[model samples]
Target chain A: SHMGIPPSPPIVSLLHSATEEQRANRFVQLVCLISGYYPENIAVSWQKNTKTITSGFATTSPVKTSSNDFSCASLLKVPLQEWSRGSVYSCQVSHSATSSNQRKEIRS
Target chain B: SHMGIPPSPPIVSLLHSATEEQRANRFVQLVCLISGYYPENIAVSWQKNTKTITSGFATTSPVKTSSNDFSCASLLKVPLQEWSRGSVYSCQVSHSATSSNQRKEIRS
Candidate 1:
């Protein structure tokens, strides 16, 4: 049953969820949604500028979507001080289905 | 008026706050408490096995203690998967009053 379909590479999108309160309160949240991938096992990591960020982010378990595909969200939360440092943030995603990883990025 | 006494270097201590649930649930918390420092300005950083860890840790603002000395804590939280990897974790503390930084370390 698992081998019925080929591995589907994920489509990646970057989102910034910032509210007035969040801006005033000194934090910013960046969401990376990876969608339309087969096989639930995947990994997400983040980078600030050129340095690999080891924390301040978490990935959700893959959820079953239409067409038997899977979707997951990786949330990156950092203090406004760090976010305001003019750093470029990136989300790196890896899946067994894809020959190479996918990356999406945003500028502060 | 603020410079009444000499600068004081922090006394560093390391603590592991791991419960049974944390051990089973795949996360570990390490605490580095820096106490008895002066001037209310200090910085803290973390390292894992000789590499400077740029994230997964946070430091607090210096607070005035009973003796007018200042104290603060730096917390390092990591997934148990990383904690169980037999790494040496260290917390480095710096203060203007000290000629050299203070460091406390723990091993997995």
Candidate 2:
């Protein structure tokens, strides 16, 4: 359920899935999705321990959904051992709108 | 770039960035990124000239980029010929806020 009023800085999260079969053999992925910004300019990236991350794949690149809005995503792949262990990975998104970004450490 | 404010309604866009390399051999991807909404509840899909398309994917889900906003996206894969031929593939994004969606047939 997503609905709100008044827009501002972006909301961000870190998403990674590492199952058994796809463990160290294949490597799970950590993806960051940034959404909800009144600004029309932004960028997406992955971050490890709060620093700007410089590796991964993104589906949306400063791409717009409507005319004056923006949203984006990025994926960082890591093995289950590395993922399930203690790794501080996050999806870092910076809005060209001055200041905004998000990150999730782990849900488990 | 991207930026916008007052997350009233969700914006939608059908993105199909194809090149000569992905033209005839592999299927080019068409992605729809939905962003900019104050609501936290939403869904996305594909369409053909104004009809519900039971195809594609979703977001980190309608996620918050700004604490009070939400965003999302989707993807579709059609042959290069089919993509270049002539078709009306729209990005159908429905928000829980009552109304909103975006689409683009072609760019070249």
Compare the candidates by lDDT and give the number of the best one: 1
| Candidate 2 Cα misplacement greater than 4 A, ranges | A1-72, A75-108, B1-7, B19-25, B49-52, B56-60, B101-108
lDDT tens digits by residue: candidate 2, B1-108:
688555466544445544443453365556554554575566556666566665333344444543254545564555566555565677655665656554445432
Tally clashing residue pairs in candidate 2. 29
In the range A1-108, model 1's lDDT, one tens digit per residue, is 454877878766666645554475476767666656777778888999988998756565555643476656565667888876898899988887666598878887
Model 2 / residue B106 / CA error / Å: 3.6
True contacts recovered per prediction: 0.00, 0.00
lDDT of 2 by residue, A32-82 (tens): 545446674666655555666554344445444432445456545555555
Give DockQ for candidates 1 onward, in order. 0.02, 0.03
Residue A104 alpha-carbon offset, candidate 2, angstroms: 24
- Model 2 Cα shift for residue B87 (angstroms): 1.2
Q: Report the number of the highest-TM-score candidate.
A: 1
* lDDT score at residue A17, model 2, on the 0-100 scale: 44
